[PDB]
C-alpha cells in the first residue's frame with residue numbers, strides 16, 4: 214500500500230492522475246519525483262522550472278554544482294539528486310527535445326531510468342515544451358517501465374485525451 218490517491222490504473226504498474234507534479238509532490242513526499250530535465254540541468258520552464266521554483270531555486274544551485282563537477286548528462290540519461298522539500302530524491306531524466314531535433318527513439322532509453330526505482334512520482338516525458346506527442350510518450354512509458362509509476366499530468370484536455378485513447 215502507498216499514499217498516492219485519486220489515480221486511474223492503466224496497467225499492472227502504471228497509474229495516471231490530473232495533478233501538478235509540484236502539488237502532488239508536496240502532498241505525498243514520494244521517495245522519488247522525476248524531473249523533465251535537460252542535459253545542462255537548467256530548470257527554465259514546465260516540470261523543471263516549476264519544480265525548481267517550488268524549491269526556492271535550491272534545485273538549481275545543487276544542479277549547477279553537479280554540472281560543474283560531472284559535465285552535462287546524455288540525452289536519454291539521468292542523475293539522482295536531492296528532492297529538497299518535494300521528495301527524498303529527484304531523478305533528473307533527459308527525454309529528447311523534438312524542438313532541438315533529438316531522436317525520439319531516445320525516449321525509450323529515458324524511461325528505462327525509471328526501472329532503477331521501485332516507485333516514482335513522475336511526469337509525462339517529452340511532453341509539453343519538449344515537443345513530443347504525449348500519447349506516444351504514454352505508450353513508451355507503459356511498454357518500458359516495469360516499476361510502479363504514478364504519472365501526475367497537470368492538464369485536463371490532455372489527461373482526458375490520454376485516458377480516452379489508451380489501448
Ligand SMILES: Nc1ncnc(N2C[C@H]3CC[C@@H]2CC3)c1Cl
Pocket residue numbers: 232233234235259260263336337340341342365366367368
Ligand atoms: N507542473 C506540471 N505537472 C505535471 N505536468 C506538467 N506538464 C505536463 C504536460 C507537459 C509539461 C507540462 C504541461 C502539460 C507540469 Cl508543467
